Scaffold this active site. Structure first.
Site, PDB file in Angstrom:
ATOM      1  N   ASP A 155      10.179 -12.719  -8.548  1.00  0.00           N
ATOM      2  CA  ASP A 155      11.479 -12.895  -7.906  1.00  0.00           C
ATOM      3  C   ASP A 155      11.700 -11.843  -6.827  1.00  0.00           C
ATOM      4  OD1 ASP A 155      14.126 -13.412  -7.291  1.00  0.00           O
ATOM      5  OD2 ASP A 155      14.913 -12.493  -9.123  1.00  0.00           O
ATOM      6  N   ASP A 179      14.281 -15.548  -1.308  1.00  0.00           N
ATOM      7  CA  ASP A 179      14.384 -15.367  -2.760  1.00  0.00           C
ATOM      8  C   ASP A 179      13.407 -16.278  -3.498  1.00  0.00           C
ATOM      9  OD1 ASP A 179      15.103 -14.940  -5.407  1.00  0.00           O
ATOM     10  OD2 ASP A 179      17.206 -15.456  -5.194  1.00  0.00           O
TER      11      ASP A 179
END
Ligand SMILES: COCCCNc1nc(C(C)(C)C)ncc1C(=O)N(CC(C)C)[C@@H]1CNC[C@H](C(=O)N2CCOCC2)C1
Ligand SMILES: CC(=O)N[C@@H]1[C@@H](O)[C@H](O)[C@@H](CO)O[C@H]1O
Length: 331
Positions: free
Chosen positions: A35, A217
């Site tokens: 992430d 992201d």
């Protein structure tokens, strides 16, 4: 050093991408999302009360089965957009792509059933910077870099469209097999965040006219914007709002316009096939869009976020030596 290393990813339904890491001696394996929008490593813990049903359904890290575990115990809470996890700090050796590293991470003891019962993955490996790490815990990629083994201070993400290789993270470089043409680089605009300036969002420039921010992201499924921005975008598409998503009549899906993101001078265009889950062509069925509202508080937002919807089309290089993001056409 001379090595680049790779992590193979699984694609669950185009919404969750995750790979395997090992923690402890002997290795306990966990499915983890990598992430770029967060900086902490965490896995569910064997100390998580089984009244958390998410902890019954995920793989739990048992520090009591690891001979390389080192206690810390500092309590931490990690607040994401869709939910929160809480637990305590631990240290153990983590194995990712055959690179081994002593890593501080979170043992999660409180893991809400919503949203986490919907997670195929057990935990998260934050690929962000130490600046946004809760507890100022050194991130895993910073620790890998300290070993001096990686060829370059970069990592790259390939997320496959096919749901076969689900995806691939290259540690220490990029993989030419999964992109084509030139990389185009946008330098980062804020200290310690994988975030860039975006100069416009076009629908067929209706939005982001005087500039806005875009977080790249890798841990998010969709493209997101502020509730306000997305409401405007969705009015332009003719999409209906529901509890947790936007939808169109499935027959309308292929008629929907191109959405373009102006990043570093170039225009990054998604067609309807790139953002519509075209699960039917029926006029009597509803089809969900891979674009949702996600309000992100300061100092990170308000900001757009470019998740797997975007990365699926554009192979992404995250460059820490030059604080920039590179995009190329994924293949
Ligand atoms: C590509 O694989 C997709 C994996 C599925 N991802 C999610 N799945 C769920 C389900 C559990 C529903 C499956 N919920 C949420 C997500 C999710 O998108 N995230 C969190 C989880 C990885 C734990 C964001 C991660 N990046 C920081 C995002 C943030 O919190 N912020 C943006 C940066 O600034 C702070 C806020 C959240
Ligand atoms: C009980 C324990 O080990 N606590 C540690 C502390 O000793 C250390 O100063 C800190 C490092 O940031 O992490 C925490």
């Amino acid at each position: 050093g001379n090595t680049t290393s790779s992590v193979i990813l699984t694609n669950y339904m185009d919404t969750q991408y995750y790979g395997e890491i090992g923690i402890g001696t002997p290795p306990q394996t966990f499915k983890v999302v990598f992430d770029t929008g967060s900086s902490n490593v965490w896995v569910p813990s064997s100390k998580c009360s089984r009244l958390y049903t998410a902890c019954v359904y995920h793989k739990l890290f048992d520090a009591s089965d690891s001979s390389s575990y080192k206690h810390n115990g500092t309590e931490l809470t990690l607040r994401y957009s869709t939910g929160t996890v809480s637990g305590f700090l631990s240290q153990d050796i983590i194995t990712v792509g055959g690179i081994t590293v002593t890593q501080m991470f979170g043992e999660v003891t409180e893991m809400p059933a919503l949203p986490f019962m919907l997670a195929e993955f057990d935990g998260v490996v934050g690929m962000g910077f130490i600046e946004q790490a809760i507890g100022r815990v050194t991130p895993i990629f910073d620790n890998i870099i300290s070993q001096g083994v990686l060829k370059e201070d970069v990592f790259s993400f390939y997320y496959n469209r096919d749901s076969s290789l689900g995806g691939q993270i290259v540690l220490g470089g990029s993989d030419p097999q999964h992109y084509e043409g030139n990389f185009h680089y946008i330098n980062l605009i804020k200290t310690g965040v994988w975030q860039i300036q975006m100069k416009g969002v076009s629908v067929g420039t209706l939005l982001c006219e005087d500039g806005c921010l875009a977080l790249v992201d890798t841990g998010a499924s969709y493209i997101s914007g502020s509730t306000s921005s997305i409401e405007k975008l969705m009015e332009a598409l003719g999409a209906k709002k529901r509890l947790f998503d936007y939808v169109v009549k499935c027959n309308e899906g292929p008629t929907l316009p191109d959405i373009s993101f102006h990043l570093g001078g170039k225009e990054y265009t998604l067609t309807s096939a790139d953002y519509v889950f075209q699960e039917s062509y029926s006029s009597k069925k509803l089809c969900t869009l891979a674009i949702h509202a996600m309000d992100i508080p300061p100092p990170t937002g308000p900001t757009w976020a470019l998740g797997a919807t975007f990365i699926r089309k554009f192979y992404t290089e995250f460059d820490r030596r030059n604080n920039r993001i590179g995009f190329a056409l994924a293949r």
